[PDB]
Amino acid sequence: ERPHAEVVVKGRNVEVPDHFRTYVSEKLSRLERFDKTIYLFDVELDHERNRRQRKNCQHVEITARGRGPVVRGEACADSFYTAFESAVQKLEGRLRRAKDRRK
Amino acid sequence: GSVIKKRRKRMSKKKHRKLLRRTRVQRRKLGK
Amino acid sequence: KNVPHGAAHIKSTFNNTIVSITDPQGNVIAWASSGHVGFKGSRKSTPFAAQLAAENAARKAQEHGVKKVDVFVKGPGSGRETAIRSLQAAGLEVGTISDVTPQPHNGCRPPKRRR
Amino acid sequence: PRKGPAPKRPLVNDPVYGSQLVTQLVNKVLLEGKKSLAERIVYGALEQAREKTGTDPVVTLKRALDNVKPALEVRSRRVGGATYQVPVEVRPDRSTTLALRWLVNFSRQRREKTMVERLANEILDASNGLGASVKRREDTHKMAEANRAFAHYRW
Amino acid sequence: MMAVKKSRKRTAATELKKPRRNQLEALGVTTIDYKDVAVLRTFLSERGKIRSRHVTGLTPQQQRQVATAIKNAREMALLPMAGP
RNA sequence: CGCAGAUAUCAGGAGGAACACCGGUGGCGAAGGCGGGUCUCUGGGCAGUAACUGACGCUGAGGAGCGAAAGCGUGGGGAGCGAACAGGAUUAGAUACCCUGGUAGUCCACGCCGUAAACGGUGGGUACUAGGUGUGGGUUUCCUUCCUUGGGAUCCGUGCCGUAGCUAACGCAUUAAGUACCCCGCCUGGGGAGUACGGCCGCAAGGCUAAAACUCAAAGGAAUUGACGGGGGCCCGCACAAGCGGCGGAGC
């Protein structure tokens, strides 16, 4: 199931350098590491582009399939890196908890 | 009563303790 | 040879159950357990194992020539009286019951707690 | 039904035979509303049995039902790290019903070229004590024997 | 004729009841001696163990005196202790 | 671990730690703590009589002594339990829980260290300050059987509820966190830190005494509403269960 993590990279309207793609696929491999139950990872990279913003420029929705229970991690930050890492850590909480309750 | 306070105390204590476990040799066989 | 009347010891615990027939002197004739009945591991705390084990041993004692029994029980047993019913089903006369589970007078240290 | 159950439907009697297990049978073999097709299949098969045996097919039917109808079955439960199967007694209603379900679903995968023939031969085979229905019922009793140990649950 | 309480009729009773009892100064006594085992067998069960105060009624004085006597008795085998 | 004859069962012996039922919001000890039994040696407290001296009292820096357990040393002993440690299993990985085994240690004698949530988180001594309620001990008068949680009063200790009063609140409340005096120790923003340097003690571990630079604009206590909970209790919904057909497999 190791390349079976169905990567889904995407951005509605953002300048998306293709090294962000490297970042995303690597940070998702990082949790392939400790969850061997994975089918789908739909992911977004969104941008509200309002003027005089409320401290939260970029946004991310993430959802993942497991055997039955699906996982959901949403995040928000100024740029790509805090968004990636924050949604990653929220998924890590979810998945530590899920593999603690799995048994 | 809380335990946050006692925990910060405990952590400082522990780190100093482990430092002394690691320097039990050098302290003795230096400061004579 | 044979003995018409003897005694029976029944040791029921959390994870197993076992019996043994014996003279009042202490000389066994016949015994059985859930391991010889066939169950294994974790199934053999149930009273059904007690039924089958006591039944087999009682029939062995019927073979070696027993007709009446004294009965002595010991330990945490879900199926004590279940084994008793099995014995009295097997065609044996219940002599005398006694619930001697060995209690100490606050002696040797037991192990610690689990979780 | 957290508040409570509701009644069962009042089966009709058969216009021809005088038995409501037959209307139960057509309603269990039914598929896609073709009740009259079920009816004519069943009547043809039972009359095939009549010419096979020289007598009423209903008696051999109920004899087959006496063969394949259990009164004990399984009911699982998840407990303590390993899900346990448990024997549970079965009231005659669901006994007959599940027996008929076995009967149909193991009739369908036969090779008499036609449902009417498959079904009739299965019924005869079960009256005789050979059908896969009987086989599965024996497997059920085998399981109950293997798991008598869990009756003290009484559930 | 009269009730167990509301004893407005006799003097303050020199009698004992279910809450109150001082069973030894009450009755059943010659004197507290480990010798007299027939008396000490009354403050036990058939399984040899010992009663409590809210069972018997004794003061702690008599209780502990009697328990010590019992225990000396089991030591000198004058009394069947619980065992094999 | 056994299949080289286990487990079980019985007869006996060897053996060393802890001593069920009494025994618990119960007794003693300044504190730590303290029960198998018997003997010896010894201490303290309480009440009553209030015969005796006649303010000798209270506190107490410094200082000495005692002081749970784990530890250290010499010696002895070592059944069970068990740091470490080995393996098994779960695990994504488990140097961890769980299982099997098992050394130091727990135990005794003689010395050490001298700390803990060593807690009533309430220093000691003393007088007055509404009560009720159980309870342990000892005196004593009346209905008096005078063989009694007898009952009442009294003294000492011990717990619950509860006035005024008090406190940020919680709650304390005649055993005060109330009202007042006497004496001691201690704190003066959080961190850095009960840390380093220096010193004293100690066989060693380590303890006591004890700062600064630097840095933060807070650290915090009690309580309220909410939300949450792999906390609990009462309930419902095609939520599962029962039962039927589908999806994912193929083509459009």
b/e map D83-96, b = 16+ CB within 10 Å: eeebbeebeeeebb
**Tokens in use for C2?**
């044979």
Give this entry's resolution in angstroms. Answer: 3.6
DSSP state of D108: T
Name subunits touching A (3+ CB pairs < 8 A). none
Q: Quote the CA–CA distance of A57 and A84 in Å, as a whole number.
A: 14
Judge contact between A44 and A12, C-beta under 8 A: yes
DSSP chain E: ---SS---SSSS-S---SS---HHHHSS-S---TT-HHHHGGGB-TTS-B--HHHH---HHHHHHHHHHHHHHHHTTSS--S--
Taking 3-state DSSP, the helix, strand and coil percentages for chain B, each rounded to the nearest 5, stand at 80, 0, 20
The CATH superfamily holding the domain D20-147 is Ribosomal protein S7/S5 (1.10.455.10)
Sequence-ordered list of residues with C-beta below 8 angstroms from that of B31, at least 6 positions apart, any chain: none
**Nearest C-alpha of chain D: how many angstroms from C1?**
36
Sequence-ordered list of residues with C-beta below 8 angstroms from that of B5, at least 6 positions apart, any chain: none
Q: Quote the CA–CA distance of C23 and C10 in Å, as a whole number.
A: 14
Q: How far is CA A30 from the centre of its chain?
A: 11
Q: Which strand F nucleotides have any atom less than 7 A from protein CB atoms?
A: 7-11, 16-24, 26, 36-38, 79-82, 90-92, 97-99, 117, 121, 136-138, 142-151, 191-195, 197-198, 204-206, 220-222, 230, 235-237, 239-245
Nearest CA among D142, D149, D137, D152 for reference residue D68: D137
**Angle at which helices D57-68 and D132-146 cross, to 10°:** 30
**Nearest C-alpha of chain D: how many angstroms from C16?**
13
Judge contact between C71 and C95, C-beta under 8 A: yes
Structural domain boundaries in chain E = 1-84
Contact D152 C43 (CB under 8 A): no
Beta strands C68-74 and C93-94, pairing class: parallel
Q: Quote the CA–CA distance of D122 and D110 in Å, as a whole number.
A: 9
Beta strands A58-65 and A70-77, pairing class: antiparallel
**Tokens in use for C12?**
């029921």
Q: Identify the burial level of C78 via C-beta atoms within 10 angstroms of its C-beta, where 0-12 means exposed, 13-18 middle and 19 or more buried.
A: middle
Judge contact between E65 and E72, C-beta under 8 A: no
Sequence-ordered list of residues with C-beta below 8 angstroms from that of E81, at least 6 positions apart, any chain: E48, E74
Number of folded domains that form chain C: 1
Interface list for chain D against chain C, based on CB atoms closer than 8 Å: 148-152
Sequence-ordered list of residues with C-beta below 8 angstroms from that of C8, at least 6 positions apart, any chain: C19, C20, C21, C22, C69, C70, C71, C72, C87
**Nearest C-alpha of chain C: how many angstroms from D52?**
47
Nearest CA among D91, D70, D89 for reference residue D155: D89
DSSP state of A61: E
> What is the chain C residue with the closest CA to D82?
C42
**Angle at which helices D115-128 and D92-107 cross, to 10°:** 130
Closest nucleotide over all strands to D97 (CA to C1') = F243
Q: How far is CA C98 from the centre of its chain?
A: 13
- The experimental technique behind this entry is cryo-EM
Q: Max alpha carbon distance in chain C (Å)?
A: 52
Judge contact between C69 and C21, C-beta under 8 A: yes
Structural domain boundaries in chain D = 20-147
Sequence-ordered list of residues with C-beta below 8 angstroms from that of A58, at least 6 positions apart, any chain: A14, A45, A46, A47, A48, A76, A77, A78, A79, A80, A83
Beta strands C68-74 and C5-12, pairing class: parallel
Sequence-ordered list of residues with C-beta below 8 angstroms from that of A70, at least 6 positions apart, any chain: A63, A64
Q: Quote the CA–CA distance of E48 and E32 in Å, as a whole number.
A: 18
Torsion of CA D37, D38, D41, D43, to 10 degrees: -110
Residue C62: how many other CB atoms lie within 10 Å: 14
- Domain extent for C97: 1-115
Beta strands A58-65 and A46-47, pairing class: antiparallel
Q: What are phi and psi of C19, to 5 degrees?
A: -140, 165
Helix (H, G, I), strand (E, B), or coil: what is residue A87? helix
The domain that holds C42 is classified in CATH as: 3.30.420.80
Chain C residues whose CB is inside 8 A of the D152 CB are 46-48, 78
